């Protein structure tokens, strides 16, 4: 009568399996979505049919799926942090962490202790982090080159999204928004308008922080030297027509029906018609580096996903302004870090060598999955990158366009340094928590 009536305990033999099987399952769930050729996935809640949808976003898949395993809930919560905080790398964190535990389960099968594995992964994460730091490339001068890098990073974030077809138009919107900012990377100053009609290519832009709200019934289309008072008067609750004329008699602009973001954004930041709706256009405001991106679509489902993937680009792009360092994607950074770990395996004690070798294989499995999802021979491309990086040539990566290897700098593929840094650390820290666990305890549920 040790654990009965709902209360359960998994011993070291079973808890070692349940801890990895729960985490590895979440990795294999959404690894297909990795890369620009990611595979879609259907989501259908039980008991209801209206919840059908299709997507290839690794973040959206993990948010909606429920999790009962505690080991998997840790890996999922650590992924949602990357989506809300950084906006990119949600899928690479889940895949890199799961591939590490998959290899770790093979190491413990060889009677390698989990603590001995964690020691190697800590030394590998330092050498891996040092590789990106040396290969990172900043751009203080040559704003044209720095502007081009923001365009390349915008395409990488928008890859495998709804806006991937017409990304050439949205790369000019997101970069122009962050370029017009040129300072603090507060995304509050970057409003995103969503209105019906027009294709995705018809997305306009306004640098005067255009608004998604119409005001009053008969308001003045122009006011000179307006003094803003939020609660020119702005209020979240609607303004009845009677006090409107009282403000109208005083020449005060009666702004009504503001939202929480409106009060939060307008505090720090003419009539315009875009999409058959009256919009509020400011000008000459104090700290007028703000702007607004005007989306256009057929319905709201198109505009909602347009805001999510675009906001994800603004997150990393804003992070790219705060940190101008960039690294080459497409398996160049993942393979470069994996090479330094294999070099570190030459100068290390015994058991730490075998554990660090698995850390490199987990990094090499990222381009292997990007090639497999695209249909190319991953064993040929990935093994070719090893021979490339092993003898100089710290630029080679996967060319998803042609299906071969090419210089990532010439092809124009690059990612932020802080994104790949957090992806490396959040994945190692996530897998480190699972290995430290050896026994799950479940009490009698109420």
């Amino acid at each position: 009568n040790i654990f009965k009536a709902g209360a359960d305990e998994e011993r070291a033999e079973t808890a070692r399996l349940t801890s990895f099987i729960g985490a590895i399952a979440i990795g294999d769930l959404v690894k297909s979505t990795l890369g620009p050729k990611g595979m879609d996935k259907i989501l259908l809640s039980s008991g209801r049919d209206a919840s059908l949808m299709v997507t290839n976003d690794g973040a959206t898949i993990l948010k909606n799926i429920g999790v009962d395993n505690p080991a998997a809930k840790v890996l999922v919560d650590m992924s949602r942090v990357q989506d809300d905080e950084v906006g990119d790398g949600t899928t690479s964190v889940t895949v890199l962490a799961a591939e590490l535990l998959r290899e770790a389960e093979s190491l413990i099968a060889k009677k390698i202790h989990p603590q001995t594995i964690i020691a190697g992964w800590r030394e590998a994460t330092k050498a891996a982090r040092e590789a990106l730091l040396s290969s990172a490339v900043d751009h203080g001068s040559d704003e044209v080159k720095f502007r081009q890098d923001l365009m390349n990073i915008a395409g990488t974030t928008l890859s495998s999204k709804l806006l991937t077809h017409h990304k050439d138009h949205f790369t000019k919107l997101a970069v122009e928004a962050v370029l017009r900012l040129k300072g603090s990377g507060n995304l509050e100053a970057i409003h995103i308008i969503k209105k019906l009609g027009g294709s995705l290519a018809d997305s306009y832009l306004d640098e005067g922080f255009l608004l998604d709200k119409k005001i009053g019934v008969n308001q003045p289309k122009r006011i000179e030297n307006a003094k803003i008072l939020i609660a020119c008067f702005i209020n979240r609750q609607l303004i009845y027509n009677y006090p409107e004329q009282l403000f109208g008699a005083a020449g005060v602009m009666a702004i009504e029906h503001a939202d929480f973001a409106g009060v939060e954004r307008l505090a720090l930041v003419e009539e315009v018609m875009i999409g058959e709706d009256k919009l509020i256009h400011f000008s000459g405001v104090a700290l007028g580096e703000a702007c607004t991106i005007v989306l256009r679509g057929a319905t709201q489902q198109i505009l909602d996903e347009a805001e999510r993937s675009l906001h994800d680009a603004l997150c990393v792009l804003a992070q790219t302004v705060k940190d101008s360092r960039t690294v080459y994607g497409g398996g160049c950074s993942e393979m470069l870090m994996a090479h330094a770990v294999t070099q570190l395996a030459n100068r290390t004690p015994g058991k730490e060598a075998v554990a660090m070798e698995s850390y490199a294989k987990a990094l090499r499995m990222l381009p292997t999955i990007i090639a497999d999802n695209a249909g190319y021979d991953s064993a040929d491309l990935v093994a070719q990158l090893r021979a490339a990086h092993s003898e100089g040539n710290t630029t080679a990566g996967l060319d998803m366009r042609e299906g071969t290897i090419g210089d990532m700098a010439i092809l124009g593929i690059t990612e932020s340094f802080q994104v790949k840094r957090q992806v490396l650390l959040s994945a190692a820290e996530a897998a480190e928590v699972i290995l430290r666990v050896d026994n799950i305890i479940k009490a009698a549920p109420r």
Partner: protein
């Protein structure tokens, strides 16, 4: 190989469910399509061959199979014809994908390859098509008439077809505009009379009556739309009316008349001489007392109107919706020259309002007939006429039927694949072989051999042109250009466009996740 992880089982699960919907709807293709028996759960049974009606009455539960059902609805909205041909094409492409996936080809390579066949496919059909003049009302008449002969009504096509030709040419600039809105042409019908009696009204025609209002006529009306219900005071919250004696009981009637008249006084100030009351059932939309006050102000009562019927009135006269009397104004008013309710023998109590005098291009068709079915098929035929004519406005061209576009498409794509390199060759050849399911299905329904028919036509297309197609009227291969059996270009183009996008979408499904 080991093949430990097997996500391909979901591809075969989605392909089988997708192919199942196509295999059922295949036999119902063409005029000689074999009918199908549908039985409702209550006990009723029906027989039909329209593929659109069969898919709705299938109760599809699989996600991938539902994409073919929603796909068929997209073809109806865009083109209005070829609903059954789309689902048959998608089922054969996915069935062809089952052979390619076994060979070790990735869905992304198959998806990108099919787009190249679609890009070259649209060029093949567009090159061999027959351009026509849109302003020429001679081609539009015979085009819809011969097409309507293939529809249910073969005798009364000559009457309803030119009614739709004039209805479109009236509201659409001939040979200048490319887009057309079918919602701008409403079709009203009532029992009694016959199909010969019809009227293409330049204004608008409704179905509801203005009773018990006694105005019956308002000239130079400024039509307005108000959704808030005009009636005596009502409160949803807990309330209680006070009555001290019979005087207070009768005083409330005087105060009840005021509440109805106070909102009418604000409407009278704007000059709104006709009100459009939105149809409402949750509460009294227009009480009895409101009638006389509206009769005093010489306002015509229009109530119990559908939102779609108001949507036709929105663009017709330029009226906006008003959710409250306080927001009611003069700028949100339409216009009208002479409003009246006509009550003819068979047309019924119709609300005929002419002379809109507003920016807009709309018309309305009055119809008469003995039974409900006689008028029902008249409106069903007008839609297909308007749909096929809409296909010609967007794509001013024609093409032969009998599956001839699928043979020229399949024939030249096989030649196009020889010039391609990589996996696209087999992926495009499989795209070509999939098109042959359509004419082989037409040949099967016509009693011919499915193989020798398409096998003979592939030689006639290599030597001849797209004129060679299956003629079910005569029961054999004939020159379809002489038989006058043609269809617009948008049907064949939108079919390959929407079907391939669904196949590419289904191919990209790696797995499905059940949320909660």
């Amino acid at each position: 190989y080991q093949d430990r992880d097997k996500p391909a089982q979901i591809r075969f699960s989605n392909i089988s469910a997708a192919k199942a919907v196509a295999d059922a709807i295949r036999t119902s293709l063409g005029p000689k399509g074999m009918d199908k028996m549908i039985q409702d759960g209550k006990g009723d049974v029906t027989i039909t061959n329209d593929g659109a009606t069969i898919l709705k009455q299938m109760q599809v539960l699989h996600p991938a199979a539902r994409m073919l059902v929603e796909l068929s609805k997209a073809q109806d909205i865009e083109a209005g014809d070829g609903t059954t041909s789309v689902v048959i094409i998608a089922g054969s492409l996915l069935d062809s994908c089952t052979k390619l996936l076994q060979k070790g080809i990735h869905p992304t390579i198959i998806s990108e390859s099919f787009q190249k066949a679609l890009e070259k496919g649209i060029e093949i059909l567009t090159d061999m098509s027959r351009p026509v003049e849109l302003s020429d009302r001679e081609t539009l008449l015979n085009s819809a008439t011969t097409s309507l002969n293939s529809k249910v009504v073969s005798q009364y096509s000559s009457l309803l077809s030119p009614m739709s030709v004039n209805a479109v040419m009236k509201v659409i600039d001939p040979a200048t505009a490319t887009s057309v809105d079918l919602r701008d042409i409403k079709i009203v019908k009532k029992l009694g009379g016959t199909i010969d009696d019809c009227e293409l009204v330049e204004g608008l025609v409704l179905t509801q009556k203005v009773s018990n209002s006694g105005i019956t006529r308002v000239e130079k009306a400024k039509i307005g739309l108000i959704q808030f219900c005009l009636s005596a005071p009502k409160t949803d919250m807990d309330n209680q009316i006070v009555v001290s004696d019979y005087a207070q009981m009768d005083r409330v009637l005087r105060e009840e008349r005021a509440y109805i008249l106070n909102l009418v006084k604000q409407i009278k100030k704007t000059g709104c001489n006709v009100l459009l009351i939105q149809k409402s059932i949750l509460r009294d939309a227009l009480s009895d007392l409101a009638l006389h006050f509206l009769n005093k102000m010489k306002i015509m009562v229009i109530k119990d109107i559908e939102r779609e019927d108001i949507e036709f009135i929105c663009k017709t006269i330029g009226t906006k919706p008003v959710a409250h009397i306080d927001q009611f104004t003069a700028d949100m008013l339409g216009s009208a020259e002479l409003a009246e309710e006509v009550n003819l023998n068979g047309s019924g109590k119709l609300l005929k309002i002419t002379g809109c005098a507003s920016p807009g291009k709309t018309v309305t068709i009055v119809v008469r007939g003995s039974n409900k079915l006689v008028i029902e098929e008249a409106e069903r035929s007008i839609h297909d006429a308007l749909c096929v004519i809409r296909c010609l406005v967007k794509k001013r061209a024609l093409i032969a039927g009998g599956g001839a576009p699928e043979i020229e498409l399949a024939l030249r794509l096989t030649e196009y694949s020889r010039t391609l390199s990589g996996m696209e060759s087999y992926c495009v050849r499989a795209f070509a072989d999939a098109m042959e399911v359509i004419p082989s299905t037409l040949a099967e329904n016509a009693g011919l051999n499915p193989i020798s028919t398409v096998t003979e036509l592939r030689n006639r297309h290599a030597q001849g042109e797209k004129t060679a197609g299956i003629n079910v009227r005569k029961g054999g291969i004939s020159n379809i250009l002489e038989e006058l059996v043609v269809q617009p270009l948008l049907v064949s183009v939108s079919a390959l466009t929407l079907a391939t996008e669904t196949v590419r979408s289904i191919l990209k499904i790696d797995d499905v996740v059940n949320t909660r």
